[PDB]
Design an enzyme around this catalytic site. Structure first.
Site, PDB file in Angstrom:
ATOM      1  N   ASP A   1      13.066  -1.741   3.830  1.00 25.06           N
ATOM      2  CA  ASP A   1      12.943  -0.526   3.052  1.00 25.06           C
ATOM      3  C   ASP A   1      12.580   0.685   3.915  1.00 25.06           C
ATOM      4  O   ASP A   1      12.260   1.745   3.392  1.00 25.06           O
ATOM      5  CB  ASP A   1      11.907  -0.778   1.981  1.00 25.06           C
ATOM      6  CG  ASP A   1      10.468  -0.550   2.418  1.00 25.06           C
ATOM      7  OD1 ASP A   1      10.068  -0.979   3.498  1.00 25.06           O
ATOM      8  OD2 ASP A   1       9.758   0.117   1.667  1.00 25.06           O
TER       9      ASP A   1
ATOM     10  N   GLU B   1      -5.047  -8.417   6.801  1.00 24.63           N
ATOM     11  CA  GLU B   1      -4.068  -7.372   7.019  1.00 24.63           C
ATOM     12  C   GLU B   1      -3.879  -7.054   8.474  1.00 24.63           C
ATOM     13  O   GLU B   1      -2.756  -6.913   8.961  1.00 24.63           O
ATOM     14  CB  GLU B   1      -4.461  -6.080   6.313  1.00 24.63           C
ATOM     15  CG  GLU B   1      -4.263  -6.055   4.801  1.00 24.63           C
ATOM     16  CD  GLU B   1      -2.831  -6.300   4.275  1.00 24.63           C
ATOM     17  OE1 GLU B   1      -1.842  -6.180   4.995  1.00 24.63           O
ATOM     18  OE2 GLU B   1      -2.692  -6.612   3.097  1.00 24.63           O
TER      19      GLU B   1
ATOM     20  N   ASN C   1       0.717   1.597   3.503  1.00 20.30           N
ATOM     21  CA  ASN C   1       2.155   1.865   3.575  1.00 20.30           C
ATOM     22  C   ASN C   1       2.611   3.319   3.540  1.00 20.30           C
ATOM     23  O   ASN C   1       2.123   4.108   2.710  1.00 20.30           O
ATOM     24  CB  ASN C   1       2.809   1.079   2.445  1.00 20.30           C
ATOM     25  CG  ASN C   1       4.316   1.066   2.574  1.00 20.30           C
ATOM     26  OD1 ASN C   1       4.979   1.888   1.964  1.00 20.30           O
ATOM     27  ND2 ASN C   1       4.921   0.202   3.355  1.00 20.30           N
TER      28      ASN C   1
ATOM     29  N   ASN D   1       8.768  -2.303   8.313  1.00 20.42           N
ATOM     30  CA  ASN D   1       9.394  -3.132   7.303  1.00 20.42           C
ATOM     31  C   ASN D   1      10.830  -2.662   7.276  1.00 20.42           C
ATOM     32  O   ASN D   1      11.187  -1.672   6.632  1.00 20.42           O
ATOM     33  CB  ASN D   1       8.774  -2.902   5.939  1.00 20.42           C
ATOM     34  CG  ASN D   1       7.285  -3.223   5.941  1.00 20.42           C
ATOM     35  OD1 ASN D   1       6.888  -4.366   6.149  1.00 20.42           O
ATOM     36  ND2 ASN D   1       6.408  -2.245   5.731  1.00 20.42           N
TER      37      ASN D   1
END
Length: 130
Positions: free
Chosen positions: A49, A35, A60, A46
């Site tokens: 979205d 990660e 997230n 990102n």
């Protein structure tokens, strides 16, 4: 902070991650490696979205932490996303424990499915005395 491998293994051990919801330390180490490369300062926006992944576990901002700029944010860990960019990972670990209390568990992170599931992950903890 960028952790050394065994340094991180002993820190996660101390914070109660070994066997948390049936997940071994080697599986948590495989997840942090892919990660973030064990880097607490890692962020990834990102664009599709509008959410950002924060810290060593790339948690997230839509579902878990709040940064104030993500559409539809739930903030299930009830944490500012800035708490996941600290050198001290105790907050990132408390939120990662929350993520895996959902039924998906560690499968929530796709990177774990791609790089760690059904592989031999024991080399991530070998020699750390953990």
């Amino acid at each position: 902070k960028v952790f050394e491998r065994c340094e991180l293994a002993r820190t996660l051990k101390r914070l109660g991650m070994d066997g948390y919801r049936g997940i071994s330390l080697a599986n948590w180490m495989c997840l942090a490696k892919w990660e973030s490369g064990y880097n607490t300062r890692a962020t990834n926006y990102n664009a599709g979205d509008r959410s950002t992944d924060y810290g060593i576990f790339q948690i997230n901002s839509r579902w878990w932490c709040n940064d104030g700029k993500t559409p539809g944010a739930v903030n299930a860990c009830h944490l500012s996303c800035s708490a996941l960019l600290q050198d001290n990972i105790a907050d990132a670990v408390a939120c990662a424990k929350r993520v895996v209390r959902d039924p998906q568990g560690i499968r929530a992170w796709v990177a774990w499915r791609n790089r760690c599931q059904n592989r031999d992950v024991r080399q991530y903890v070998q020699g750390c005395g953990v």
